[model samples]
Target: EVETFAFQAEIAQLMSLIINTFYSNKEIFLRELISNSSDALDKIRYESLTDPSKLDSGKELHINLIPNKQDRTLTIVDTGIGMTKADLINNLGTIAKSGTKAFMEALQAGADISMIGQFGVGFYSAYLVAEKVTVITKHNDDEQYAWESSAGGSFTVRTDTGEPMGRGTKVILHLKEDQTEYLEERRIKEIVKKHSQFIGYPITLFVE
Candidate 1:
């Protein structure tokens, strides 16, 4: 069953403003997603301290970037602690929660929380360049699931039926027409190096 939910707030205008500001610094979007991958890896590592079983299913923690020029898509794959359905709704859907909007206001000088949740990390930033975003993830206790949104005021979540994701999250951004540069090997590598140079795990980009 696919469940769809409406966003609590009207963010098209807010999103447009954010995208306008980000137009000149498009690479920041990559930085935000990369940051999230590492954070998810950190979460799994911390959890493994008590339950070693959490570390059993996946390979070493790392991030992979797969760019498909023909399809005009870019995907970031991370072998890390994946999200639960609750997380899909709360963490990913909680952009209107105090912790997030408040952080954006503070950052822009951004949104409410003294600390921003994942929203602060900029998941919505995917919209700056993407017409759509799809997240496929698997947590230890749950089967694989897929979440997708095109920023049309609602998002959908459904059970995924493809190959196993092992234990991790895969984020695929279908770039907007003018944003195909994200699919380039050189451009993506530069963005990764500039922002995540010292990022703890290896970040691999597949070569043509």
Candidate 2:
């Protein structure tokens, strides 16, 4: 079953500030998301140290940057610890509920712009370039679920019954026309090199 949710009043405003004020440096969205994926990968790897059966057989750890020219989308996919329906609602649904207060407080002051990820609103940076964002994820212990938003009024979460994504998260960014620069392989690699090069696992780019 699918469910719909309204953005928390505070979260609604915070998302707008992220998209408008941070437009100049939208490239950092890639950096923030890659870091999140790396963290998720770290969690599963650490957990598996004690509970070996929790991991899927024959799966490797890695992040994939797939920029599709035809569809005008950039997908950041990872084989990592995914989320349950509740996680989807809490983390991305009402993003500020967990990381909301600090970011808002900081935004009021002349805070450093780089604090985007530090304040836990890094995911909203997707709105800088994407008209709509979709997060489809599958966790080891929960059913697959997709969370989608336009960074407008509200978002949605539904059971994902499409092709099995097999143990990870796929963040599909439907790029806005002005931000199509991200669809280029060279541009993506440069962004990865500047911020995410030292990430522990492989970060692969899928070429068309």
Candidate 3:
């Protein structure tokens, strides 16, 4: 069964701005997402120092990009600390209104562009080109689960009944008709090399 949740006031406002306005170029979405993956890896790597058996045990940290032209989808997979059910709700479902409001004010005032992630709404930028987004993740403390949204007023989270993902998160983007170019391996390769090359983890383009 799918559990549905309405967007919080801050989330609704931030998503509205993201969907209806241009916060940054669409290509920046990839960079932001890669940065997020890096952050997750950094978190787990640090935790492993204290608890050697964290998450995927000794699994190597990496990011994988899987493109499907037939389905017009692009999936980004990261071997890092995955989120639990509560994390899904907290991170994706809400933002601090105070911070978001301040960020908006600063943005309008021509704030520094480097503060994109500081306001804490970088994930929703997927709406710039995707019609739908699906996140399937597995955490050490929780069973595999999935989260989904269409950049609408509500989002859903549910247990994923598929094969175990081991330990990590996979973000699948159902590309908009006009965004089909993003499903091209060449385009994604260039984008990753240009913007995400310096990321600490190895970013691999998974091709058949």
* Number of the top-ranking candidate, with lDDT as the measure: 2
Between 2 and 3, whose lDDT is larger? 2
User: lDDT of model 2 at residue 49?
Assistant: 93
- Report how far off residue 35 is in candidate 2 (Å): 0.6
**lDDT per residue (tens digit) for residues 121-199 in model 3:** 6676677778898988887888888999886778899999986778888889899898887887788988898888899
For model 2, how does the per-residue alpha-carbon lDDT over 1-208 read when each residue is reduced to its tens digit? Answer: 7799988777788777776774477888899889889888998899899988767632688999999989999999998888878888876533465576887777688675567888777888888889999999998878989999987879999999987888889999999998999999889989999999899999999999
Tell me the tens digit of each residue's lDDT in model 1 across 1-208.
8999875563444455555653456677888788889888998999989888888887599999999988888999999888888788664534455644565567565332212234453676787788888999999988899998887678889999988888999999999898998988889988888888989999999976
- Tell me the deviation in Å of residue 55 in model 2: 1.3
Query: Of the candidates numbered 1 and 3, which has the greater TM-score value?
Result: 3
Per-candidate Cα lDDT values, in order, are 0.78, 0.84, 0.79
TM-score of each: 0.88, 0.93, 0.91
Over 4 Å off, model 3 = 22-24, 55-58, 93-99, 111-115
Error of 3 at 85 (Å): 0.2
- The full ranking of all candidates by TM-score, starting with the best, is 2, 3, 1
* Model 1 residue 41 lDDT score: 95
TM-score of 3: 0.91
